[PDB]
Amino acid sequence: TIDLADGNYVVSRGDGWILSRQNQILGGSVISNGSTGIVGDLRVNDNAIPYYYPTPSFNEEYIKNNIQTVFANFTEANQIPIGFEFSKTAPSNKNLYMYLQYTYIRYEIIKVLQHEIIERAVLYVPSLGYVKSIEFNPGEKINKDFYFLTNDKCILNEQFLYKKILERVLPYSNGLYVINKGDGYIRTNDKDLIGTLLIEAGSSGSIIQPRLRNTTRPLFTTSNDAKFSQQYTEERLKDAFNVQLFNTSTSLFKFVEEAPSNKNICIKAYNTYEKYELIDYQNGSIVNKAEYYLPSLGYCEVTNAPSPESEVVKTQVAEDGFIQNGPEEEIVVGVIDPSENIQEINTAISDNYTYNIPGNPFYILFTVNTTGIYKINAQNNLPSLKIYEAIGSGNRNFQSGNLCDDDIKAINYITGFDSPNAKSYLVVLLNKDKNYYIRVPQTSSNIENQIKFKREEGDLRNLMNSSVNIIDNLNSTGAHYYTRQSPDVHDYISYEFTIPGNFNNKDTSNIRLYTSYNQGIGTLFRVTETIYNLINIQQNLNLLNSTKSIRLLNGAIYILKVEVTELNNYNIKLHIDIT
Amino acid sequence: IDLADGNYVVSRGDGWILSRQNQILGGSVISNGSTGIVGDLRVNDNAIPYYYPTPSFNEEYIKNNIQTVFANFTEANQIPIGFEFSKTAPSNKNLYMYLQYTYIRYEIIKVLQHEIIERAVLYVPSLGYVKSIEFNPEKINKDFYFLTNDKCILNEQFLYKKILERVLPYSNGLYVINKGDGYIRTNDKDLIGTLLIEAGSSGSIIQPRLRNTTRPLFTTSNDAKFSQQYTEERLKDAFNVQLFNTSTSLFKFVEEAPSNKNICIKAYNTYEKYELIDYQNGSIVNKAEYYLPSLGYCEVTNAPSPESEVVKTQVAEDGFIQNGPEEEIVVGVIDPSENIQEINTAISDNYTYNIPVNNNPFYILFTVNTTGIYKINAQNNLPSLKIYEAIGSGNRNFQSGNLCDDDIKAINYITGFDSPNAKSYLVVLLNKDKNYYIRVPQTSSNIENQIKFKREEGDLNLMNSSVNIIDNLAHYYTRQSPDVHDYISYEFTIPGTSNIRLYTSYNIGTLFRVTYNLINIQQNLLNSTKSILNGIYILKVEVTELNNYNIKLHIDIT
Amino acid sequence: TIDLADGNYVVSRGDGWILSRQNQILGGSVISNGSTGIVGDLRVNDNAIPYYYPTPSFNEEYIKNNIQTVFANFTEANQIPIGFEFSKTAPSNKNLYMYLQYTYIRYEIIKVLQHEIIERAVLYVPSLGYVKSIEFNPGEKINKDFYFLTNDKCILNEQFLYKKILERVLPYSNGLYVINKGDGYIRTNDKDLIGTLLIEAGSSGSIIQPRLRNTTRPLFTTSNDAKFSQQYTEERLKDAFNVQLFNTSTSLFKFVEEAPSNKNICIKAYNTYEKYELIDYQNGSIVNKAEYYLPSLGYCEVTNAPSEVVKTQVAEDGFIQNGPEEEIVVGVIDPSENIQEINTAISDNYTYNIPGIVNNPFYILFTVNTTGIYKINAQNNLPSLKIYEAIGSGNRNFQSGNLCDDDIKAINYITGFDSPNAKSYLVVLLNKDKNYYIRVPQTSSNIENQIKFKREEGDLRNLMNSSVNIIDNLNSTGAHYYTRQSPDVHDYISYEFTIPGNFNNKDTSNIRLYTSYNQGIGTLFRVTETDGYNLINIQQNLNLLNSTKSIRLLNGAIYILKVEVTELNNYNIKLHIDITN
Numbered sequence A: 001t002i003d004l005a006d007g008n009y010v011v012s013r014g015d016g017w018i019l020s021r022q023n024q025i026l027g028g029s030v031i032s033n034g035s036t037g038i039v040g041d042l043r044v045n046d047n048a049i050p051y052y053y054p055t056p057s058f059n060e061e062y063i064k065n066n067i068q069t070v071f072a073n074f075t076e077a078n079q080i081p082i083g084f085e086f087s088k089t090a091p092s093n094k095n096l097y098m099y100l101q102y103t104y105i106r107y108e109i110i111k112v113l114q115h116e117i118i119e120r121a122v123l124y125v126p127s128l129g130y131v132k133s134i135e136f137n138p139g140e141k142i143n144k145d146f147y148f149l150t151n152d153k154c155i156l157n158e159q160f161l162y163k164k165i166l167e168r169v170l171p172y173s174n175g176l177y178v179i180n181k182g183d184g185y186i187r188t189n190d191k192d193l194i195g196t197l198l199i200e201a202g203s204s205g206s207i208i209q210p211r212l213r214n215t216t217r218p219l220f221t222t223s224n225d226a227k228f229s230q231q232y233t234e235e236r237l238k239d240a241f242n243v244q245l246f247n248t249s250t251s252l253f254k255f256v257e258e259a260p261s262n263k264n265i266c267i268k269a270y271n272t273y274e275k276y277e278l279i280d281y282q283n284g285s286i287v288n289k290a291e292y293y294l295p296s297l298g299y300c301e302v303t304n305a306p307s308p309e310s311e312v313v314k315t316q317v318a319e320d321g322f323i324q325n326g327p328e329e330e331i332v333v334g335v336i337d338p339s340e341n342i343q344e345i346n347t348a349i350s351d352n353y354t355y356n357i358p359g360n361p362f363y364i365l366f367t368v369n370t371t372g373i374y375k376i377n378a379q380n381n382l383p384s385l386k387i388y389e390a391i392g393s394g395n396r397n398f399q400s401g402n403l404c405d406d407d408i409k410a411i412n413y414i415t416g417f418d419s420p421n422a423k424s425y426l427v428v429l430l431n432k433d434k435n436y437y438i439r440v441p442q443t444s445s446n447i448e449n450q451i452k453f454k455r456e457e458g459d460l461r462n463l464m465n466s467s468v469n470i471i472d473n474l475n476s477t478g479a480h481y482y483t484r485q486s487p488d489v490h491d492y493i494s495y496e497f498t499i500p501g502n503f504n505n506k507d508t509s510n511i512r513l514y515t516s517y518n519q520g521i522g523t524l525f526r527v528t529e530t531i532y533n534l535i536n537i538q539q540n541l542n543l544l545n546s547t548k549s550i551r552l553l554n555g556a557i558y559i560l561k562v563e564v565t566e567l568n569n570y571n572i573k574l575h576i577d578i579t
Numbered sequence B: 001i002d003l004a005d006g007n008y009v010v011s012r013g014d015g016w017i018l019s020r021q022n023q024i025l026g027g028s029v030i031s032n033g034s035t036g037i038v039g040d041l042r043v044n045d046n047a048i049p050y051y052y053p054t055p056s057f058n059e060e061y062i063k064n065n066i067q068t069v070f071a072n073f074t075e076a077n078q079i080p081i082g083f084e085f086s087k088t089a090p091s092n093k094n095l096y097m098y099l100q101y102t103y104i105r106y107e108i109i110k111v112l113q114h115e116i117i118e119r120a121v122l123y124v125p126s127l128g129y130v131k132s133i134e135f136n137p138e139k140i141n142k143d144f145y146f147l148t149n150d151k152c153i154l155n156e157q158f159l160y161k162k163i164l165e166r167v168l169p170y171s172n173g174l175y176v177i178n179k180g181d182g183y184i185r186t187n188d189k190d191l192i193g194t195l196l197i198e199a200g201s202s203g204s205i206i207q208p209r210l211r212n213t214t215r216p217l218f219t220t221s222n223d224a225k226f227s228q229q230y231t232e233e234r235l236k237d238a239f240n241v242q243l244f245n246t247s248t249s250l251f252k253f254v255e256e257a258p259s260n261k262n263i264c265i266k267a268y269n270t271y272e273k274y275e276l277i278d279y280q281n282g283s284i285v286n287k288a289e290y291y292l293p294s295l296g297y298c299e300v301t302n303a304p305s306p307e308s309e310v311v312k313t314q315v316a317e318d319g320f321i322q323n324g325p326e327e328e329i330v331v332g333v334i335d336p337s338e339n340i341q342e343i344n345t346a347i348s349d350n351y352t353y354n355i356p357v358n359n360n361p362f363y364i365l366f367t368v369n370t371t372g373i374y375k376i377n378a379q380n381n382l383p384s385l386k387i388y389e390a391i392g393s394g395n396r397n398f399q400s401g402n403l404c405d406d407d408i409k410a411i412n413y414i415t416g417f418d419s420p421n422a423k424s425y426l427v428v429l430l431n432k433d434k435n436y437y438i439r440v441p442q443t444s445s446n447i448e449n450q451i452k453f454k455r456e457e458g459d460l461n462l463m464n465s466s467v468n469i470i471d472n473l474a475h476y477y478t479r480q481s482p483d484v485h486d487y488i489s490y491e492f493t494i495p496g497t498s499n500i501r502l503y504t505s506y507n508i509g510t511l512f513r514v515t516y517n518l519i520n521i522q523q524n525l526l527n528s529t530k531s532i533l534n535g536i537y538i539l540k541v542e543v544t545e546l547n548n549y550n551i552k553l554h555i556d557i558t
Numbered sequence C: 001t002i003d004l005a006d007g008n009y010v011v012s013r014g015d016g017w018i019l020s021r022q023n024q025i026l027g028g029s030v031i032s033n034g035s036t037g038i039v040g041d042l043r044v045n046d047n048a049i050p051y052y053y054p055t056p057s058f059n060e061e062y063i064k065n066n067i068q069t070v071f072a073n074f075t076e077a078n079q080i081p082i083g084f085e086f087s088k089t090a091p092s093n094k095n096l097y098m099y100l101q102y103t104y105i106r107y108e109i110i111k112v113l114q115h116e117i118i119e120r121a122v123l124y125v126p127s128l129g130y131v132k133s134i135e136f137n138p139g140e141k142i143n144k145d146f147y148f149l150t151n152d153k154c155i156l157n158e159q160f161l162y163k164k165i166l167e168r169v170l171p172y173s174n175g176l177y178v179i180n181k182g183d184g185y186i187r188t189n190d191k192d193l194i195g196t197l198l199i200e201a202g203s204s205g206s207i208i209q210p211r212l213r214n215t216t217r218p219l220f221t222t223s224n225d226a227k228f229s230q231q232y233t234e235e236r237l238k239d240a241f242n243v244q245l246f247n248t249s250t251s252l253f254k255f256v257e258e259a260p261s262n263k264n265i266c267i268k269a270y271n272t273y274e275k276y277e278l279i280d281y282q283n284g285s286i287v288n289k290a291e292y293y294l295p296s297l298g299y300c301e302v303t304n305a306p307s308e309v310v311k312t313q314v315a316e317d318g319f320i321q322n323g324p325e326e327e328i329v330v331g332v333i334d335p336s337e338n339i340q341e342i343n344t345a346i347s348d349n350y351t352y353n354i355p356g357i358v359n360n361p362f363y364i365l366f367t368v369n370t371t372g373i374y375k376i377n378a379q380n381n382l383p384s385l386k387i388y389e390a391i392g393s394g395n396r397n398f399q400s401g402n403l404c405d406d407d408i409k410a411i412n413y414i415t416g417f418d419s420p421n422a423k424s425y426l427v428v429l430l431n432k433d434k435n436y437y438i439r440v441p442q443t444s445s446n447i448e449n450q451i452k453f454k455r456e457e458g459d460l461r462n463l464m465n466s467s468v469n470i471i472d473n474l475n476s477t478g479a480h481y482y483t484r485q486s487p488d489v490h491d492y493i494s495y496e497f498t499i500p501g502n503f504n505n506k507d508t509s510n511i512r513l514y515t516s517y518n519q520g521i522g523t524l525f526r527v528t529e530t531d532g533y534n535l536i537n538i539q540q541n542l543n544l545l546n547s548t549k550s551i552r553l554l555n556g557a558i559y560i561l562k563v564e565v566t567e568l569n570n571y572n573i574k575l576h577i578d579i580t581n
């Protein structure tokens, strides 16, 4: 013809192509007096035979492979059976004839030389269907053209989609996360298009997934099939949200549109996915990542019916990829590492409990007897611990003063650090009817350690939901900094430090307290210990590159609690500069 | 904090969605006036109950106590049940809907000093819930997608139980009674599930018969006589029930909620209640019940705020409720222990059927050639006979002047007595197009008897009556009473004027004087005192007050 | 007492028969405020078991065979499952109880002797179903009669359809045609009835073909199972319209009717067919004919719910079209005629060699490189050729200046004659993007022949879409006639004739030009080949049917008459050329 650019091209001429001569080869219904006729079909293996019209340059295999590279793979989609139907209601005291015809997507392979198409192979792939209806009287003459098409024709507007044939800081604790990135995900270039129905004005039209076969094709990518295999990811999905069926479904979706009396209507259906990510996060880095696109329940676009004789505007294909047509969603859900054993405290912790550690990382499942602030630590505050909440423990099986296991592997990090040589203790509000997981990290000592739990009825409640770092051995002048994993916005980190010198209760020293990268509100306490009381000294201290200085009593213990208000870096570096 | 010490089994209600598992089976996006229909089918694999035990309350204890009072969910989770929702996106928005399983939340609680000390929980799968939101290309609230704690989308319930440790005037024979449809067991023991249908949306509960099995419920007083198989046969005989453990019959319940009302719809499996009895001399000698799986019951309530007042209620007693309309269809059935002999010629004006020691009882199938009054009797009017009409007979195959067997075992007693030693004859209007069954009783004579049929064009008017022959002349004669407006007659010959007193004891008498023609002499006889000729007379009696199974007739001479 | 006397009769008492006693043996549903209940079933294997009530003269086998001969075959229909449902909506603040019951068609076999029915066998064939509903309160007892029927009864009006038990000129070229005679064809009586639903006022009712099985039963008649066997016809159907499935379908049809609130309604559903004819047409005659009734997607008749029973005799076996009128005539390549190919697109001139036998006919597939009028002929214009268009060709695979085979055997006759001994040439508009078939007939000459194609940018374009007969014959005065296959109304036939005598450009002869049976508009040209050839227009709107007008034409001069058929009264058009002095 006359086109543009030299070489071979794969082209999608669009959906809605009906073929010549074979209009009534499926039959039609006659409906009389106000009755509604519903005609439809079910495309499967057998009825989804495509029609190849090759050329010497472009054989069937070449046509197939190149079309399925860029566009919907119709050899796998002829597996999952899809239905459609049309519904016309005859008027009173007059008859109506409607007949059904398959629609096709018309793909082409073209050779272009000097702005001319020299060769064209065509492939018609079965899509859905089109019903045409007429009202008729006994021996009313009907136009031959109503029954019979002499040339291939698109009932929709045609398309010319071609391609030349070349031939963020995550403040997460270390561990596994399963993230729901949302629903309504389709691939580009209609690789997940179900089909299109032209719905004549006054008629009605549906596109159906009846699950006559109970099989779905999830989409799985992984960075390491050894660590994150599909089976493993499915388990994490089970752990995270309790997904059961992955390659199966009993769940039906249908889309239905009734065209008004005055105007025709068009409806396009897609298979969709719900996008999950499984990540392995370590020290600010995604060490492994899989993507699981779980077969969902579809997307449906309803447009007014476009002139079948419109201007065909040629467009180049998009890059392989996804588009979310559903709303935005991020659900981050930690999951118990299955490489890490779970030990159990069968007693609800009341005022005091001491768990003896045999001496490889592990979780400890436990609950409290009474909602309250608990201090938790190992001996000498080494190693550093982490505490997670099992998600949705509350309001199931209960027994006063005893643990009931809900068997929840979905964990919600509260506070704690992954630094086995840094001294810390935890101060957490624990809820009586929840379960919690303590995570004990890997240690290279074989010395019998012990985790200690203590109910705090005092001022240590001000450190609520915080790990407290123990800062040893400040010198009497100069700089000091302390890099740790930053909490998220509005989460907490605390630091317990003793001012240089001997305690006189009069001699002070000039301390400057600030962060380096992240913004934080700092509240400062002075510890006075008889049997911990915290005196609040300043709690309006914004820390990011602060220069403010406050004189603190020498040889006296203080605790700084910091609220992250701007997460600019994975780490939070804390400066304590002394004068 | 509640009331009363001990252990309790509790139904917290249907409509519980679980935490974390909200979008676990996908959702649809619909754009501009398009309607999305999403649905699922609860079946073996996806219908997993979730036990949350406590030391006092094991899984077994939880199961057994919940299935004692409430639905047996281990038999129900086999039969596949469907539900769907239909939401229509507006024009000026897109719409995202996602589907989630609902559960009934049962609990076992220990109560001490007006306080719950221990709670085990059991989530039994019910149906499903769709949650939808309108959106533009925007941050949606975390809470829309993700539930952190278990929650009821309906209003919750607290249904608990403390955990401890007239005259039937029927002839002797078998009856199959339809006691009606819409029978459910109590406390939702036959509940399918509940759908919340938000206003403007639509909701269905479906029985598609993806499996054909149904689970009928059977009781019997004697599994020897009335076994299940036997009862099924009687059901076949009575009403022609064919499938007992199967059905191809579909039921769906569908509601489209208005814009103004959120609607709630509860579906139950129902039963049709049949009774098979053996009735003898006013008494039910044996009785089975067959609850035939029916096509369900659908309760529509206005949807109550999910944050409503929880009113604690004690369970009802084990049993049934009829939610369908009340019904009694009594249908006699040929005793299958009793052979059926045939008169293959249509009875004309006269016919004599010859019968060959204990001559176990038997039926005789026959028809007449002309609609008319027939006198029927055995030799010397012994034994006493009964005549039944086969129900709906002879609208089918016909052959002029011959019997066609329609194979109808469903019989409708007309008249006759169950005293083989009392002399009587029958006077019945017979219809040319019907079949009738004569029932010949057990006799201890081996003497060759004969049943005689005679068309009566005149006099006999004793229509639809048995006539007792009184040979043996105070005197009393106890018989099975006819029903209100049915007849019983008495023929007596006296030593031979004389003063006769005629009255009944427990339960209108027309009196005739015989000469083969009947002259009408006299037109409440219960405890009558009226009286006033020796030498033959016939009394016809119409029961108007059925107070006793029996009618005793006094004939006192003075 | 009845009139049909002396013999045995098969009788259809109608559909809508419910049986006594067995009304609620399937159950029912209770629905409360506003809810809609839908109950239904699907007739198949076990639940489509008929109830035979025979008599000595009429056993089950006799009853079956004689009803399925005249009426629906229920043994073939009971395999393909048919569904129905009813939908009732309970009002607000009120309960509603509906129960379901099978309906039957009631057939009878009767013996009649001397105006008297002396024997009757009855057969109940399962049809669909009926739902009966009532409003109630939970406490209430409802009347026995609602739940329970003591005698067989038709819920529709009964019927008595009985039968005594014994024991247009087609202007088509020669070749095969497949004609679509249209859709919505049912057989007579109710041989194709699916069933009837009585739909209570305010309720709703559907009849469903869900294709739980795929099989369909096409209906085939043939005049010669040797020539037109079913398999052969199926091929022709494939060739004509590309029908693939004949005995199967995945295509669903359901009918739904909602009865108004005051009046009950009835809907009858039928299986329908689409009627195809395959004919072998030769010289105005259908030498062979098969009929193929392809299973379609049904017919749905909605009538008011009705009565006096009128006895009526069955119709003759046959079809009734309830769908709209349709005639689609589609020629098909005779498969007993091989296809030769011109693999290069024809330019302005091409010569295809076709040597000779004393042959079988054959086709030649070719396309042109440029849209235009082409003159096509064999050497000396013998034999006569025919040209067909392959229908819907060349919208598909394309290659510049080459033929692509689209494998289209569906052909659309343009022009040409069968008479293999009449000299002629073709003048046709050919389109660059179409394929065409030339058909070469059987000849008894062994002469090495050639077909010649020439693009005509001349006056010969006025003969567009016409065969031109050569009359070399006129050797003298007198009468002459020329019978040919008539074109259709508004199609063309042309005649090129040389007037007897030597050309002097003065001496004329008186020629009278007329047709015998068909009316035609005749345009007459004088051919002048000198410098170049022209057509000079001599006479313009001549209506030729039994014409008496005469035109003195130059002797030994060539003329061409183009004729437009306007009234097709005969298959043939006989052309008279009567010459005088």
Ligand SMILES: CC(=O)N[C@H]1[C@H]([C@H](O)[C@H](O)CO)O[C@@](O[C@H]2[C@@H](O)[C@@H](CO)O[C@@H](O[C@H]3[C@H](O)[C@@H](O)[C@@H](O)O[C@@H]3CO)[C@@H]2O)(C(=O)O)C[C@@H]1O
Residues within 6 Å of the ligand: A419, A420, A421, A422, A423, A479, A480, A481, A482, A483, A484, A485, A573
């Ligand atoms: C003024 C001063 O002494 N600052 C130093 C601090 C403290 O020694 C330390 O915070 C006490 O716990 O340490 C600093 O550097 C550490 C920082 O990068 C953290 C980040 O988590 O890692 C520490 O090293 C790890 C090491 O990577 C592990 O392998 C483990 O075995 O040893 C330690 C465990 O904590 C860095 O030493 C700091 O900024 O916090 C800077 C000065 O070294």
Ligand SMILES: CC(=O)N[C@H]1[C@H]([C@H](O)[C@H](O)CO)O[C@@](O[C@H]2[C@@H](O)[C@@H](CO)O[C@@H](O[C@H]3[C@H](O)[C@@H](O)[C@@H](O)O[C@@H]3CO)[C@@H]2O)(C(=O)O)C[C@@H]1O
Residues within 6 Å of the ligand: C419, C420, C421, C422, C423, C473, C479, C480, C481, C482, C483, C484, C485, C574
């Ligand atoms: C004046 C004159 O000769 N007219 C006669 C014409 C012409 O001879 C002829 O049409 C010129 O081509 O022929 C007429 O009869 C022919 C006509 O019936 C055609 C049918 O279209 O069939 C012819 O015979 C065929 C025969 O059927 C074949 O088997 C084979 O032998 O070829 C011949 C061809 O001639 C008839 O001759 C006519 O009406 O057209 C008779 C005229 O008298």
